[PDB]
């Protein structure tokens, strides 16, 4: 999967990386993707750049919001996606990301939509097994 | 929805925030999403980092391009999306964004692809009503 | 299509633009999109904020990795996609981007999910021909 993590620049580089490590660990755990199937872009913004409210649920966030956008191939069940959300959020609690400050979106594609390098589509050639 | 607003560094931080306000207000008017259903990421670039032409339409854009990428649930009609493009673009005119300088893309997902916080999928559980 | 290119800050201004040119020429050559159907967002990161391993394929990348995320309407075949992955990489090679350092993902939507400007949906209105 390709994960876009848009967060706040007031978090240290170390915590920033720990967020990335904790997002990956959870995906490996739930999805059971290869350990090295790690593809992440970290973008740190002034808190003014991330506007994230509640959808009228009834809670407020701190300025240190973490948006995690998960780009992954189709096929995962509703319940597996529920486990993703829950596992990401719990991994991020000890590292200083509150449950209220987490927002996750999934966008799907197919296996033939990926090139890991060398101008090759590895799932299509079967060099890389499809999950 | 989650909105990635990619704009340019010459635009005042004040104007950017107003751009982001107009887009949200446009979405709430047309899509009738909850008023606090606000999830935006602003990325200001050196204008040379954004390259947007006309697809051979026959018009020129200023360097100050504003690309809005809307990530929303499937199910909005063709006609509603047109209404969304139009309303976003009229909102931006009085703020300082010319009609030529707006570009909008929609990418679709499902209600089970969202988490608003706390490790929960709110459209799935019933915490939040599906719009 | 809208392209998001995420690369590292140590690449010069000229190389970023040449990376952006090489990617576009690739899509024109293979997809036969209009020459001016060019919509690219470049974001530069500290090599630390881009994490791209190998998925267990068995290779190493340099810190100077380039992630190209293609947003294009559905309809292109698997083979044309394979051919795009190939084209992009072969074009980036003389520009100083190695095969090992290129990662590509495609995400699709529909013709009616695009506004190229003026609050208008050009594929819908017949103004721009469906490729």
């Amino acid at each position: 999967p390709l994960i876009r993590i848009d967060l706040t620049s007031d978090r240290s580089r170390e915590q920033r990386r720990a967020i990335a490590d904790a997002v990956h660990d959870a995906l490996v755990e739930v999805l059971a993707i290869p350990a090295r199937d790690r593809f992440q872009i970290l973008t740190a913004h002034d808190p003014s750049d991330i506007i994230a409210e509640d959808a009228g649920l009834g809670f407020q966030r701190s300025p240190s919001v973490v948006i995690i956008h998960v780009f992954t191939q189709a096929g995962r069940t509703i319940e597996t996606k529920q486990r993703v959300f829950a596992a990401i959020t719990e991994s991020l609690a000890p590292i200083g990301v509150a449950g209220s400050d987490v927002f996750i979106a999934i966008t799907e594609n197919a296996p033939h939509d990926w090139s890991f390098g060398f101008g090759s589509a590895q799932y299509v050639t079967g060099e890389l097994a499809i999950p």
Side-chain angles (χ1 to χ4, degrees), chain A residues 14-80:
Chain A
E14 219 190 303
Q15 183 172 78
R16 212 190 287 204
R17 182 54 162 262
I19 289 151
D21 287 358
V23 171
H24 182 68
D25 290 330
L27 268 64
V28 169
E29 187 193 319
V30 171
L31 260 34
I33 61 210
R36 295 196 106 270
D37 190 1
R38 177 165 192 177
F39 300 103
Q40 300 178 325
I41 304 141
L42 284 40
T43 303
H45 303 265
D46 186 270
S48 294
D49 285 4
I50 303 109
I51 316 301
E53 306 178 4
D54 65 358
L57 292 158
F59 68 86
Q60 290 177 242
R61 316 187 190 255
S62 73
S64 316
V65 185
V66 169
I67 319 287
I68 300 155
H69 200 324
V70 179
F71 291 96
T72 193
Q73 67 192 59
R76 304 310 192 149
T77 56
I78 300 112
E79 290 70 32
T80 307

Side-chain angles (χ1 to χ4, degrees), chain A residues 65-105:
Chain A
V65 185
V66 169
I67 319 287
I68 300 155
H69 200 324
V70 179
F71 291 96
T72 193
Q73 67 192 59
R76 304 310 192 149
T77 56
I78 300 112
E79 290 70 32
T80 307
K81 296 172 171 177
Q82 291 185 85
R83 293 181 66 207
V84 166
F85 302 149
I88 272 109
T89 316
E90 79 178 312
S91 292
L92 291 180
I95 58 98
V97 180
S100 70
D101 287 354
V102 179
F103 181 91
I104 321 174

